[PDB]
Amino acid sequence: VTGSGKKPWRQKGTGRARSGSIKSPIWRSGGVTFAARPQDHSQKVNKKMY
Amino acid sequence: AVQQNKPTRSKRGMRRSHDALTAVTSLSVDKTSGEKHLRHHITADGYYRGRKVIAK
Amino acid sequence: VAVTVYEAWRQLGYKGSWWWPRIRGP
Amino acid sequence: ARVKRGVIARARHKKILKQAKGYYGARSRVYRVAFQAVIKAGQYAYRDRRQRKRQFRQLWIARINAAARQNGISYSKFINGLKKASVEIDRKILADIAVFDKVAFTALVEKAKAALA
Amino acid sequence: METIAKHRHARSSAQKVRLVADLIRGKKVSQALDILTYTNKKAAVLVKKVLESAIANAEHNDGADIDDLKVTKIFVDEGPSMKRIMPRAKGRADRILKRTSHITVVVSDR
RNA sequence: GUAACGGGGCUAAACCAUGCACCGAAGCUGCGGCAGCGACGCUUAUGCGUUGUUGGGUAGGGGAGCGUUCUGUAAGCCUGCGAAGGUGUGCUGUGAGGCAUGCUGGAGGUAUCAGAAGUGCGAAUGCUGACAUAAGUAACGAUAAAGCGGGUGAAAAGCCCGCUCGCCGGAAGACCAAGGGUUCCUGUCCAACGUUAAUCGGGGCAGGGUGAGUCGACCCCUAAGGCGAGGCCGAAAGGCGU
RNA sequence: CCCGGCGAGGGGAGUGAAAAAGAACCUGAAACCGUGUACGUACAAGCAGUGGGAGCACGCUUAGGCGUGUGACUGCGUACC
RNA sequence: GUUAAGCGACUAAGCGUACACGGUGGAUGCCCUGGCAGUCAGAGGCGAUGAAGGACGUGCUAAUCUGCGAUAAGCGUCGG
């Protein structure tokens, strides 16, 4: 995902939940947890079965 | 100091029960001109108790 | 006539400190 | 491939909120509170389905006792005499009779007293 | 017959306007006008203008004879809010709301 | 704060012994319904009977299902005499659910049997938008200070004229440099901006305005310092220097 | 055409199948805020429900009685992860 | 008719529940000249005859896009 890997705010001190990246899959406009790739779906059948 | 729980709309309404306002309940009629006004105030064209005040 | 527009800004999260003595210090 | 949860979630929330009518305040307007209210109501209903029978039996006994003492005998001796006379009428019917018929109840008392004596 | 006049996007909070609306709910128009004339409030001017507009509508479009009109209905709703920024101390910022309202008046000879 | 019977109260409504009654649980029995596992029969296979018995449950193991979006069956079927979606009501199943219909809506939806999953949310000081509470509360930014008459205007404490009062005066006065970039002047407007109103404005819109032989840049001369033909160094990039 | 400051906003008329399609414009949910009607509530103590239960209002019904809303009084009962 | 004693509907400043009608807000449904992953072909460079990328101009025109370069939303010739 397009963006930079800079921590949005410091770990401790601010009263907000801990964050470490703007591309986290639970942020709006973040990535997909288990994104897909192009795939092959063909199977195999024995000659005799055919 | 700040609240620990959110007060309800019922409590909000009960607090405002004393916030209503009242009307003047009566107006007065000048003897000569015959128009309405507040008590002990001059009319809109400088009349008071029949006499003709400046009316600037 | 012009239309109305809004804007916003966030702070830097200034590192404030508790300047009084510690609650249950050493 | 991509599925949107828009309609099913609304159906579930409406279904839960429908059976929370008449509850006070936010318990009938907000889903998070209404869900707990409905669950607790279900548990209470399950328990009271058992408590009802006890409450009614206790009321019947208390009502029989008064009429029995009106005719001049206590509840315990009255039903002991009835058992000795082999009379199988239960407590609900006995209380109903004691209220709506003052003569049949007197006849029953006579029979119980005769058998017990 | 019912006649309606409205003022939308009035520059005032609904809670402040609601204090004046209940003063005239159910009165005759003749006494409602001079009740509104002698209250020292900002919203009284707005409500008075709306009421006069309603009376004129009820006279011109439909039948005449405003001598037997009454204020049958009146209510105030909430319009959209404008959002602004007000600076505070030590570099903080706060959000300001400027609320509006809708004013409706219904009159009827009956 | 009675405060060492749960209370009221009790001389038996206390304690010992004997006896007979009754109250008392989701325990047991009676009536109706559901499911699991055996045994014995019939079908002599799915299945249908006779019975016996079992059915609290976290971590965890095993078995059956509902619903959502896409592909085939699909140039099929439903639908402007009203589709999806929204909002009520009535039936129905053990449950996740299903069916019919009133109002709104204005053009799409899919039996059955198979196939594939970005397939189901209340919590993560979760992410984004909208809206509440405190509350019509705290505040309105130097304690140099204002009063009155006239004008204009829908409307004047704040605008414009006039007369008084007060404050600064090695500044809170008048010129520049750096920096800014039309904020300068005139006519029009008051939606938004001005911590209130506004007829006013450094606000909106339309016009106008900056004139050099001598003022300043440019130009001639060099400081600190920079670049540096050849040159000397260095795996490359480069370093230092006439 | 009318009210209004030669305003902002409305009410009529007209276009259109539809203006509750009027430019802040397809459909238009929830939190949140209002107006109207029925019932309850100013001697009463607690996770606000659940079991019992008068009275009142409305509708149907041939009495019989049902259906919907509210709910005096009373037994039990210390949210979720 | 007068005295006693007993019992006792009617109030709502406001609040609750249900229904009817609204406001705010922009979810859901239905769309798409916008993106994503590939198959089959092509081309694999531009530049001292001044590049890639820009500044400023150019119209009946205030501006901003798209073209163009003092011959400036265009000039000549050959074809459709």
XYZ file of C-alpha atoms (C1' of nucleotides) in Angstrom, chain F residues 18-192:
175
model
C -41.893 -39.384 74.872
C -45.845 -39.234 70.755
C -48.963 -38.020 66.883
C -50.126 -34.390 62.856
C -48.865 -30.780 59.109
C -45.489 -27.283 55.999
C -41.419 -27.702 53.035
C -36.937 -28.417 46.586
C -36.116 -27.888 39.551
C -35.782 -34.734 44.604
C -40.041 -38.752 43.657
C -45.083 -39.807 41.514
C -49.348 -38.457 37.839
C -50.597 -36.303 32.574
C -48.808 -34.424 27.592
C -44.293 -33.676 24.127
C -38.886 -34.182 22.039
C -34.130 -36.540 21.232
C -29.692 -40.245 21.928
C -27.982 -45.500 22.745
C -28.936 -50.833 23.175
C -31.887 -55.692 22.709
C -35.726 -58.318 20.044
C -38.937 -58.591 15.603
C -40.910 -57.315 10.711
C -38.650 -54.372 5.595
C -36.395 -59.642 6.254
C -32.565 -53.368 2.233
C -34.310 -47.482 3.568
C -37.362 -48.103 7.044
C -41.684 -49.679 10.594
C -42.871 -51.920 15.715
C -41.930 -53.972 20.931
C -39.540 -52.564 24.901
C -35.010 -51.071 28.648
C -32.346 -46.832 29.639
C -30.160 -42.015 29.230
C -30.404 -36.325 28.191
C -26.016 -29.947 34.283
C -21.466 -28.515 31.996
C -15.760 -24.666 31.146
C -10.765 -26.209 28.362
C -11.454 -29.715 24.564
C -13.041 -33.929 20.987
C -17.131 -35.810 17.662
C -22.056 -35.069 14.546
C -25.802 -32.368 11.938
C -27.652 -27.501 9.978
C -29.465 -21.886 8.692
C -28.306 -17.400 6.110
C -25.106 -13.843 2.684
C -22.325 -12.445 -2.403
C -20.628 -14.614 -7.081
C -20.572 -19.223 -11.501
C -23.832 -23.194 -14.269
C -28.984 -24.969 -15.002
C -30.534 -19.047 -17.758
C -32.430 -16.129 -24.851
C -35.808 -20.391 -18.661
C -39.200 -18.167 -14.760
C -41.125 -13.413 -12.036
C -41.935 -8.092 -12.835
C -44.635 -1.137 -14.915
C -51.739 -4.258 -13.463
C -45.209 -2.314 -9.948
C -38.491 -5.375 -8.901
C -34.544 -4.473 -5.281
C -34.474 -1.386 -0.865
C -37.227 1.094 3.587
C -41.414 0.796 7.333
C -45.845 -1.916 9.953
C -49.071 -6.279 10.737
C -50.464 -11.629 10.698
C -49.182 -16.834 10.427
C -45.357 -20.808 11.049
C -40.612 -24.197 12.732
C -36.732 -26.923 18.468
C -33.067 -22.843 16.768
C -30.039 -19.981 13.184
C -35.014 -18.679 10.126
C -39.309 -18.852 6.432
C -44.073 -17.279 4.191
C -48.200 -13.711 3.065
C -49.838 -8.898 3.006
C -50.943 -2.662 3.942
C -47.879 2.107 3.054
C -43.314 4.260 0.555
C -40.210 3.346 -3.905
C -39.745 3.695 -9.328
C -36.465 -0.878 -12.429
C -34.608 -4.771 -11.719
C -34.822 -10.098 -9.215
C -34.161 -15.167 -9.282
C -37.231 -22.001 -7.756
C -34.362 -26.532 -7.600
C -29.772 -29.193 -7.664
C -24.435 -28.437 -7.764
C -19.630 -25.156 -7.383
C -16.353 -21.075 -4.994
C -15.660 -17.842 -0.652
C -12.825 -10.595 0.937
C -19.174 -15.535 4.296
C -21.994 -13.550 9.905
C -19.148 -8.346 15.228
C -20.501 -5.539 21.493
C -15.976 -5.129 23.499
C -9.243 -4.870 20.859
C -7.469 2.996 25.975
C -9.847 -0.593 17.601
C -10.253 3.134 12.408
C -13.519 6.886 9.819
C -18.141 10.050 9.838
C -22.442 11.908 12.522
C -24.739 13.256 17.143
C -25.274 13.738 22.805
C -23.544 15.132 28.215
C -21.638 18.708 31.468
C -24.864 23.813 30.055
C -27.493 27.965 27.731
C -22.967 27.003 32.650
C -17.175 29.308 32.377
C -15.498 33.117 29.409
C -15.836 37.753 25.647
C -7.778 39.053 25.890
C -4.468 44.643 30.006
C -8.722 48.765 35.610
C -6.001 54.961 29.616
C -12.875 56.585 30.819
C -16.490 58.440 28.972
C -21.252 62.186 28.449
C -24.621 64.749 25.364
C -26.947 67.112 20.529
C -27.669 66.588 15.141
C -27.471 63.129 10.497
C -28.252 58.749 7.790
C -30.854 54.338 8.128
C -35.864 48.856 8.524
C -33.147 49.260 13.023
C -27.606 53.507 16.318
C -23.671 52.523 23.224
C -19.891 51.252 18.841
C -20.716 54.668 11.992
C -20.371 60.410 10.316
C -20.333 65.731 12.077
C -20.134 69.084 16.832
C -19.061 70.502 22.034
C -16.998 68.772 26.560
C -13.808 64.824 29.657
C -9.571 61.555 29.930
C -4.417 58.925 28.171
C 0.831 58.881 25.716
C 4.375 62.517 24.473
C 13.433 59.541 24.314
C 6.276 57.402 22.729
C 1.154 54.700 22.343
C 4.807 60.700 17.619
C 7.352 61.106 12.490
C 11.038 58.390 8.711
C 13.709 53.900 6.958
C 16.184 48.709 6.373
C 14.793 43.313 6.617
C 10.124 40.796 5.802
C 5.112 40.903 3.498
C 2.814 41.273 -1.403
C -2.451 45.290 -3.162
C -3.749 45.186 2.738
C -3.274 51.954 -0.651
C -7.902 55.471 -2.867
C -13.132 55.768 -4.679
C -18.227 53.650 -5.399
C -21.387 49.859 -4.053
C -23.153 45.036 -0.396
C -23.953 42.766 4.865
C -24.902 35.923 3.419
C -19.907 34.062 5.749
